[PDB]
Amino acid sequence: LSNRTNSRVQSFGGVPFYPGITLETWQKGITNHLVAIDRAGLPLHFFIKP
Amino acid sequence: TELALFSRVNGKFSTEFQRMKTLQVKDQAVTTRVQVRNRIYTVKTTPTSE
Numbered sequence: 001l002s003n004r005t006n007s008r009v010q011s012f013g014g015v016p017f018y019p020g021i022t023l024e025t026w027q028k029g030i031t032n033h034l035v036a037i038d039r040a041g042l043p044l045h046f047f048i049k050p
Numbered sequence: 051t052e053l054a055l056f057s058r059v060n061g062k063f064s065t066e067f068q069r070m071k072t073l074q075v076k077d078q079a080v081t082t083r084v085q086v087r088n089r090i091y092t093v094k095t096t097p098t099s100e
């Protein structure tokens with residue numbers, strides 16, 4: 001016999017993920033835990049103006 | 051072996067041998083690994099610190 005199970009989670013913002021958690025409780029649990037995921041910015045020298 | 055002489059002298063000789071042999075080998079090997087890593091904040095020092 002040979003069983004070989006590999007899992008791998010990666011969260012970004014939201015509840016600290018633990019294996020026994022459901023996707024519903026993870027979605028409901030981002031009420032306070034949010035992380036920037038996409039950002040737009042300007043070169044810094046553009047903010048030095050009279 | 052059965053022998054009959056003169057229809058009066060009878061001789062029986064019955065030998066039975068019986069050998070049973072059973073071998074059983076069982077092996078199990080379970081390897082488990084879990085690796086959790088939470089990176090919650092990132093605390094950086096202010097540029098203007100004394």
Ligand SMILES: *[C@@H]1O[C@H](CO)[C@@H](O)[C@H](O)[C@H]1NC(C)=O
Pocket residue numbers: 001002003005
């Ligand atoms: C593990 O091995 C068993 C053998 O009895 C098999 O039925 C099962 O599908 C394998 N995988 C898991 C995840 O249990």
